[PDB]
Design a protein around this ligand. Structure first.
Ligand SMILES: *[C@@H]1O[C@H](CO)[C@@H](O[C@@H]2O[C@H](CO)[C@@H](O[C@@H]3O[C@H](CO[C@H]4O[C@H](CO)[C@@H](O)[C@H](O)[C@@H]4O)[C@@H](O)[C@H](O[C@H]4O[C@H](CO)[C@@H](O)[C@H](O)[C@@H]4O[C@H]4O[C@H](CO)[C@@H](O)[C@H](O)[C@@H]4O)[C@@H]3O)[C@H](O)[C@H]2NC(C)=O)[C@H](O)[C@H]1NC(C)=O
Ligand SMILES: *[C@@H]1O[C@H](CO)[C@@H](O[C@@H]2O[C@H](CO)[C@@H](O[C@@H]3O[C@H](CO[C@H]4O[C@H](CO)[C@@H](O)[C@H](O)[C@@H]4O)[C@@H](O)[C@H](O[C@H]4O[C@H](CO)[C@@H](O)[C@H](O)[C@@H]4O[C@H]4O[C@H](CO)[C@@H](O)[C@H](O)[C@@H]4O)[C@@H]3O)[C@H](O)[C@H]2NC(C)=O)[C@H](O)[C@H]1NC(C)=O
Ligand SMILES: *[C@@H]1O[C@H](CO)[C@@H](O[C@@H]2O[C@H](CO)[C@@H](O[C@@H]3O[C@H](CO[C@H]4O[C@H](CO)[C@@H](O)[C@H](O)[C@@H]4O)[C@@H](O)[C@H](O[C@H]4O[C@H](CO)[C@@H](O)[C@H](O)[C@@H]4O)[C@@H]3O)[C@H](O)[C@H]2NC(C)=O)[C@H](O)[C@H]1NC(C)=O
Ligand SMILES: *[C@@H]1O[C@H](CO)[C@@H](O[C@@H]2O[C@H](CO)[C@@H](O[C@@H]3O[C@H](CO[C@H]4O[C@H](CO)[C@@H](O)[C@H](O)[C@@H]4O)[C@@H](O)[C@H](O[C@H]4O[C@H](CO)[C@@H](O)[C@H](O)[C@@H]4O)[C@@H]3O)[C@H](O)[C@H]2NC(C)=O)[C@H](O)[C@H]1NC(C)=O
Ligand SMILES: *[C@@H]1O[C@H](CO)[C@@H](O[C@@H]2O[C@H](CO)[C@@H](O[C@@H]3O[C@H](CO)[C@@H](O)[C@H](O)[C@@H]3O)[C@H](O)[C@H]2NC(C)=O)[C@H](O)[C@H]1NC(C)=O
Ligand SMILES: *[C@@H]1O[C@H](CO)[C@@H](O[C@@H]2O[C@H](CO)[C@@H](O[C@@H]3O[C@H](CO)[C@@H](O)[C@H](O)[C@@H]3O)[C@H](O)[C@H]2NC(C)=O)[C@H](O)[C@H]1NC(C)=O
Ligand SMILES: N#Cc1ccc(N2C[C@H](N)C[C@H](C(F)(F)F)C2)c2cccnc12
Ligand SMILES: N#Cc1ccc(N2C[C@H](N)C[C@H](C(F)(F)F)C2)c2cccnc12
Ligand SMILES: *[C@@H]1O[C@H](CO)[C@@H](O)[C@H](O)[C@H]1NC(C)=O
Ligand SMILES: *[C@@H]1O[C@H](CO)[C@@H](O)[C@H](O)[C@H]1NC(C)=O
Ligand SMILES: *[C@@H]1O[C@H](CO)[C@@H](O)[C@H](O)[C@H]1NC(C)=O
Ligand SMILES: *[C@@H]1O[C@H](CO)[C@@H](O)[C@H](O)[C@H]1NC(C)=O
Ligand SMILES: *[C@@H]1O[C@H](CO)[C@@H](O)[C@H](O)[C@H]1NC(C)=O
Ligand SMILES: *[C@@H]1O[C@H](CO)[C@@H](O)[C@H](O)[C@H]1NC(C)=O
Ligand SMILES: *[C@@H]1O[C@H](CO)[C@@H](O)[C@H](O)[C@H]1NC(C)=O
Ligand SMILES: *[C@@H]1O[C@H](CO)[C@@H](O)[C@H](O)[C@H]1NC(C)=O
Ligand SMILES: *[C@@H]1O[C@H](CO)[C@@H](O)[C@H](O)[C@H]1NC(C)=O
Lengths: 737, 740
């Protein structure tokens, strides 16, 4: 049978029910008995009783987050009948207290983003099987919340607990009687001003300790904060981390630290990640005794440690940075200094495993680029948001660290990456890339660069494979533009316009024919409406062309039909994006001249009023045709006469009111959602999208309903959104039942 | 005594953008000027205007067929505008009375005597943009001596036409000769010999600097400059304006100015004159020059340390404005600008888009009477289309006049001032207007940053990341009158962004405050804004929906403390409804209240009683359904009520006949099917965009429109019938009420 209202899926030897965002006012009683994991998040469920999951005895995981989208009423012992429930997520439910009578079988419990101010034995201590306990964000920057009360010895009985998260709660003191089984202790933003010798003594298995946001550096803080009296730092006793021999992660970000006691690391020889951002450590970076205590540190973050009102000429890096033998990544954003000299970075040049140097947001005016060559194995050189000139919310997130890749993985995958985006490189200077290592990935985005590309600018780094030139004012009309980058595979020219042309802008794309290895070209939002001498693009290697945000309506509306074969020369194109080109219709001869090698064609978000389906005959390899967001009214009744390869047909957000007698053995995905269908009058179809249509739920919908029951292989997603528009009697209800 | 259709009568007849397919025959006989531009008019015949001194037919049809002698019957026609009509030739038989003729943007390639010579009364002749960078156009042929007979011609515009040579036999009556982008590579001694009354000569875009050009261009062979003979401007003794922009000039012959002692404006933008700026012999020939523009004269590939300015710049005694954008250099030293410090009338220095990293700001004090210091788009760090336009000159005010009106103006917008350095404003003159917009400035304002220039009256801090939560922020600027904090957000706050606006109570002279797009949804200690002087508050783009939706009603008197306010902008605050007590707590001193572009489903009209000075209520772009029937019971001051883009379907009985103060009523783009007999000093009524039901029910309103001709109803062609189907697509006025 077809599941409702949930989307049941087979996951790793289990059956899962995706039942989120369905507007459900209560727990559905139509859930499969075989289902073991239930996701009911983002609904209007208001009550959970003993008879809420009565027919679902085999459940191991329940997610009730963000319910109801004025709190969630849960009865005492509502979950007690679920003898195999191991993971219960009750986040953002406005709970006033921890639910009474929770099953002892629980190994993972989350109560994040509630109004729980009393952590009691009555609700926690009976759960001896708990391994992960999340109680963060209960008493944070909000009213009614004064202090979180943690009953003495509540966690003492949880001898299997490996993760305890008490972050964003007014604690003021590290809770006593914590179980020695602990591995991760999260105490961020807990108002803990002092850490004593007895606070973590028993935690000999602790691998992660998060103490960030306690005594925050408030002008820099990501959250509304009150600093410790007199702007004081966190007070950590000399022997606080004395028996934390297994520590791998220590987060001390935004703790107003001015001095770092080197004795804190004497017993952690395995510390791998140390987060020291948002502190006052400019002096400690210059003469850090602690640097000699971290031989196994791989990630060091000393970002946003700038001195308020200061813009020093140089960065002072202690020579003891050379004792960080295991270092893989150094993050030094927001130090804010004017010049980087070759000698300032001498301590780092001996680190054999140093692959990332993060110097973003430093406002560096001058860098001696020859210094980068003197590095063992640099892979990422991140210099975004500096001032180099032409050389002639989610509560489960990391709030202090930039976790996303600094450079796009697709770029970095080619080799040594140099990110010089958002700097003052308004033209490419004659010596711009002098003394640079073998750069394979280069970002020069958003530099206000209005260079006239001639074929000499990138000769100093000729092995660039991926070049990002987006959000600039480049002139590439010379047919020799970028030809010095003979190995170029990816070229991003998005959001580009001539700096001075006001009345007429005529593009010359002859340079593209010079590349023997160019595979991806993005000319999006270049506002291209006329071509110069060569009116038609040519390439033997080009695989993908992104032409969105251009004026193909103007080009293909030419009185002389000059742009009738504009992309015919791209003999190996498999992907073409023609979205956002204001197209009302594509001329039959202009469509027939698209490359026959195409497999994915996107003409979405245009204004197409007509589409000659017959022309699909000239494209035997076309598997995806995307026509969403147009104004099409007719569908061909002879689709199998025009295609035998089409697998996906995307047609949502169009004006289709009639499905013709015929709806193609190749077609697997048919998207007809958000159209104007009132009714639907052996296939190999695996998905049919129909939500958003004005279905008329009279006896006429019965034939289609019978079709839905015979073909259970055809997955119809979002059945709660396949709704009756008429009659008034059925309006709002789903076409099912 | 009758309502004009399809035109709006003033005696001018505004008849533009009306979708007219032919010249209306319902134009008043008294009308002397007719504007028919931006219409679908395709034909103009002898019987077109049979039943005028000025006619505008521009942009028709959105080519234009005009018959020979179609305008000959108009014996008093003195101005005919035929721009952008796809005309293949100059219309035959034009009236001899013409004093102003414009034929721009057509396809006229032959300038003949048959069409021009007989119009001896011409004073202004525009033939620009006929043979420009478009096809079929080869070269404009100008018949020998066509302009010779036009002995009254004072302006001749031949710009954007393939001329290749200056036309011979031009009348000595000429005053302005526009020859921009005409493909004239050489100017000889005999070209402008007879033009002894010439006051303006535009030769820009002839041999253009193509990398910098605003138009697709081909440069002169070998990148050569315009060749101007030593004695080309020999008898041009009256020249005031000379435009030589984008002419690829490398050298300037000083002999060109020997006979023009009255030259006032000289445009040399977009040339190769870095060397001439350093040692210009021509600088000694311009004692009456007021405006000099030497912009975008940078050397390709170059970023010099300093700007080399010739000492002969001190010989420009009448200089008022110097424009030096796009020179592109690194440091401005006090000594590089020494030649300019003696110029007694030099009030504007334009150094925008120069990428200057360091400026010795003490140099500005050594100037006699500077009032505009424009340094936008530089690199200063924290110190610890229209064819009738000027394509090469920045004509708009450098600094907003509202700012500059206060005193010496300093524009440091779009620079690298990411924080206000301790010495940021040291050695600066008495600055009264300061722009620090778009600097990515995330300074924590404490009350010490602007102490070196304490007499700032207008401060633009928009598009920054400022922190003004300290109650002492900007209080050192005790004379501050205007403060623009638009588009501002904390650089680091991610989860919660609480504002503290206590700093506003410290100002005794603050009049205008713009907090638009600050996304304000909560206040810290002071839940109320207070000021004795504040007169205008712009609060658009904030979260008054969150503030006025407070469970504890903390923000119920949020603006009550602004005792002197007369203008309040609450647009774009996502408001579904304003609590009665929150509305009653707005200052009673209001005269203009804007709650437009919100989502208002309800408005309590009764509350308008607490605002005896309210003259403008702007409620456009909301979702209101009801209007009170007792508007005169709640107000007597209201003059303008804007209700367009709402869901109003019924106009209540005695809405208009009660409000004697109401002068402008905007009810356009609503859901009105009819205007009842029962709902019938108003000077304007907007009604276009409504689904009017054109049955005999619309007849009462139509009679009302005929009785009150003083009530101007604009866009009558857009006040259209929605029903029934027969009457659909027709204007409510274009109906035959005789059936009723
Ligand atoms: C102070 O500094 C410390 C570091 O010293 C830092 O600790 C780190 O905190 C973050 C955030 O709380 C932790 O990140 C989470 O880690 C879990 C577990 O990761 C491991 O296990 C999984 C398998 O279970 C592996 O795949 C993974 O590689 C790891 O080995 C992740 O499961 C979390 O991911 C979820 O959230 C992300 C967004 O935040 C999503 O991108 C992601 O898809 C995950 O979503 C989940 O829910 C979705 C439904 O909403 C569902 O669709 C998904 O499929 C999925 O189930 C997340 O990465 C990190 O582990 C901590 N570090 C250590 C070593 O423990 C502190 O945060 C920092 N303090 C502050 C205040 O900044
Ligand atoms: C100019 O034009 C270029 C060319 O189009 C463009 O670059 C390309 O951008 C697209 C994204 O817009 C990139 O495609 C994405 O790539 C990531 C990562 O790549 C993986 O590739 C292989 C797998 O083949 C891995 O081995 C490798 O390690 C990388 O991880 C993919 O993760 C993306 O997939 C998701 O989105 C697809 C739709 O875009 C889905 O079809 C797919 O199923 C994925 O879904 C994921 O996200 C869902 C939420 O959205 C989530 O629910 C799912 O569970 C799942 O996680 C995607 O394929 C492409 O690689 C870029 N190409 C190059 C050469 O860089 C530029 O961005 C453009 N520039 C501008 C300024 O516009
Ligand atoms: C080369 O350099 C020369 C200067 O040496 C430039 O010449 C100027 O060109 C512009 C544009 O063609 C001229 O501007 C127009 O002037 C008209 C007359 O202005 C005077 O008279 C009116 C009253 O009739 C006064 O109000 C006004 O203050 C002046 O004293 C205006 O009527 C024009 O207005 C039009 O535009 C405005 C908006 O800007 C609209 O509001 C109007 O309704 C109307 O549409 C316009 O301002 C200018 O006068 C020329 N200078 C001289 C001294 O003649 C060349 O343009 C330049 N060449 C190139 C290619 O850049
Ligand atoms: C933050 O908020 C402030 C305050 O609202 C904004 O500054 C005001 O901006 C408006 C425009 O949005 C300015 O008003 C305009 O002034 C123009 C020039 O001022 C003339 O004033 C008198 C006439 O009373 C003249 O004597 C004088 O010589 C000036 O020429 C007017 O030309 C404008 O009028 C036109 O528009 C209005 C409607 O806006 C029509 O009623 C008119 O008929 C006409 O068509 C207009 O009045 C205002 O002066 C600015 N105030 C200050 C203090 O600068 C900021 O722009 C805003 N910032 C951001 C980023 O949004
Ligand atoms: C070259 O440098 C530019 C500029 O730094 C890079 O642009 C940035 O790209 C990332 C990812 O494409 C964008 O991040 C996005 O941020 C939002 C909001 O935080 C988040 O919701 C998204 O999921 C995403 O992570 C970022 O906005 C964008 N910045 C700008 C100014 O455009 C570009 O990616 C770099 N290119 C290469 C080849 O690395
Ligand atoms: C302070 O400096 C900023 C940045 O230069 C000024 O902003 C600029 O202001 C002008 C006028 O308000 C904007 O001009 C507009 O340009 C368009 C397109 O050319 C035109 O169609 C409009 O009619 C208008 O003239 C300009 O875009 C804007 N620039 C930015 C980046 O915002 C600001 O005006 C200065 N403030 C003071 C007090 O002078
Ligand atoms: N007082 C003060 C300062 C305010 C803001 C600053 N910067 C703002 C930039 N937008 C981002 C920069 C970051 F975040 F990268 F450090 C900080 C300062 C930098 C160095 C010294 N003082 C200040
Ligand atoms: N080759 C080359 C150059 C290209 C672009 C430049 N700049 C682009 C800026 N975006 C605006 C700057 C302007 F227009 F202000 F001068 C010119 C150069 C400036 C100085 C020297 N060479 C070049
Ligand atoms: C919760 O549900 C119970 C019944 O199960 C009811 O008596 C009670 O009033 C509800 N409300 C709250 C706030 O507990
Ligand atoms: C460097 O990294 C490699 C693996 O990436 C590892 O085997 C080696 O031991 C590391 N060296 C140091 C000194 O940490
Ligand atoms: C293209 O660049 C080269 C190198 O600067 C130059 O020789 C060539 O003339 C340029 N092409 C054009 C059309 O200017
Ligand atoms: C040609 O197309 C194929 C298929 O997308 C691709 O693998 C190949 O790299 C393209 N170009 C060349 C020259 O190999
Ligand atoms: C589709 O294009 C073909 C040309 O290949 C033409 O014969 C046919 O009539 C077109 N169909 C429509 C509906 O225009
Ligand atoms: C300076 O300007 C005033 C009027 O603004 C004028 O009277 C005076 O003659 C000018 N001085 C020079 C040297 O041009
Ligand atoms: C405001 O700024 C002054 C000057 O820096 C400082 O003394 C004062 O304490 C600041 N106020 C707050 C609330 O921090
Ligand atoms: C109130 O505003 C008016 C502006 O017209 C001004 O004259 C008056 O002085 C202001 N009152 C105070 C106390 O600033
Ligand atoms: C308008 O507000 C007044 C309070 O001053 C209240 O008495 C009246 O009922 C309100 N009208 C409506 C329709 O809510």
């Amino acid at each position: 049978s077809r599941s409702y209202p949930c989307d049941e899926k087979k996951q790793n030897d289990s059956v899962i029910a995706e039942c989120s965002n369905r507007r459900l006012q209560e727990v559905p009683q139509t859930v499969g008995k075989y289902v073991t994991e239930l996701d009911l998040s983002d609904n209007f469920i208001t009550h959970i009783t003993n008879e809420s999951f009565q027919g679902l005895q085999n459940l191991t995981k329940i997610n009730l987050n963000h319910n109801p989208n004025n709190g969630l009423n849960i009865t005492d012992g509502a979950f007690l009948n679920l003898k195999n429930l191991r993971e219960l997520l009750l986040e953002d439910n406005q709970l006033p207290q921890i639910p009474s009578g929770l099953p002892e079988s629980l190994t993972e419990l989350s109560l994040i983003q509630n109004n729980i101010y009393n952590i009691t034995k009555e609700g926690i201590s009976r759960l001896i099987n708990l391994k992960n306990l999340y109680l963060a964000w209960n008493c944070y920057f909000n009213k009614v919340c004064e202090k979180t009360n943690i009953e003495d010895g509540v966690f003492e009985t949880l001898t299997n607990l490996e993760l305890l998260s008490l972050s964003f709660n007014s604690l003021s003191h590290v809770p006593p009687k914590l179980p020695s089984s602990l591995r991760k202790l999260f105490l961020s933003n807990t108002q803990i001003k002092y850490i004593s010798e007895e606070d973590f003594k028993g935690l000999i298995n602790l691998t992660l300790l998060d103490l960030s946001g306690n005594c925050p550096r408030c002008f820099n803080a990501p959250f509304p904060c009150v600093p410790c009296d007199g702007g004081a730092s966190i007070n950590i006793d000399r022997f606080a981390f004395q028996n934390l021999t297994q520590l791998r992660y220590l987060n001390l970000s935004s703790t107003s630290l001015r001095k770092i006691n080197a004795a804190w690391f004497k017993n952690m020889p395995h510390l791998k990640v140390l987060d020291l951002e948002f502190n006052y450590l400019v002096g400690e970076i210059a003469s850090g005794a602690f640097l000699t205590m971290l031989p196994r540190l791989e990630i060091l973050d000393l970002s946003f440690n700038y001195i308020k009102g200061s813009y020093p000429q140089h960065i002072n890096i202690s020579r003891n940075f050379s004792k960080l033998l295991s270092l893989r990544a150094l993050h030094l954003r927001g130090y804010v200094f004017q010049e980087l000299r070759e000698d300032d970075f001498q301590p780092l040049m001996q680190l054999p495993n140093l692959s990332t140097i993060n110097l973003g947001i430093n406002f560096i005016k001058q860098i001696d680029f020859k210094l980068f060559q003197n590095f063992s194995n640099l892979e990422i050189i991140y210099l975004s948001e500096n001032r180099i000139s032409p050389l002639v919310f989610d509560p489960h997130s990391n709030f202090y660290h930039f976790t996303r890749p600094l450079i796009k993985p697709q770029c970095a995958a080619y080799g040594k990456a140099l990110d010089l985006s958002l700097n003052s490189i308004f033209f490419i200077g004659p010596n711009q890339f002098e003394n640079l290592p073998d750069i394979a990935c280069l970002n020069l985005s958003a530099n206000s660069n209005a260079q006239v590309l001639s074929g000499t600018e990138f000769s100093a780094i000729p092995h660039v494979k991926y070049l990002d030139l987006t959000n600039n004012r480049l002139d590439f009309d010379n047919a020799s533009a970028l030809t010095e980058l003979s190995d170029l595979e990816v070229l991003d020219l998005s959001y580009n316009s001539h700096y001075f042309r006001i009345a007429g802008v005529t593009h010359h794309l002859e340079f593209i024919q010079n590349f023997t290895n160019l595979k991806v070209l993005n000319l999006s939002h270049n506002n291209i409406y006329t071509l110069t001498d060569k009116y038609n693009l040519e390439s033997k290697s080009l695989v993908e062309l992104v032409f969105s945000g251009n004026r193909l309506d103007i080009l293909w509306n030419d009185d002389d039909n000059r742009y009738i074969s504009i992309f015919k020369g791209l003999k190996n194109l498999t992907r073409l994006d023609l979205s956002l080109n204001r197209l009302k219709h594509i001329p039959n001869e202009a469509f027939l001249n698209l490359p026959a090698s195409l497999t994915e064609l996107h003409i979405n978000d245009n204004m197409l009023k007509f589409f000659n389906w017959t022309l699909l005959q000239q494209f035997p390899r076309l598997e995806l045709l995307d026509l969403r967001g147009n104004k099409l009214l007719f569908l061909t009744d002879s689709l199998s006469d025009f295609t035998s390869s089409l697998r996906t047909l995307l047609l949502s957000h169009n004006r289709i009111s009639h499905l013709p007698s015929g709806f193609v053995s190749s077609l697997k995905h048919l998207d007809l959602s958000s159209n104007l269908l009132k009714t639907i009058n052996t296939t190999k179809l695996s998905m049919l999208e129909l939500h958003g249509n004005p279905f008329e739920c009279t006896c006429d919908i019965g034939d289609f309903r019978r079709w839905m029951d015979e073909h259970l292989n055809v997955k119809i997603p979002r059945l709660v959104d396949v709704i009756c528009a008429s009659p008034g009697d059925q309006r709002g209800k789903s076409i099912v039942s």
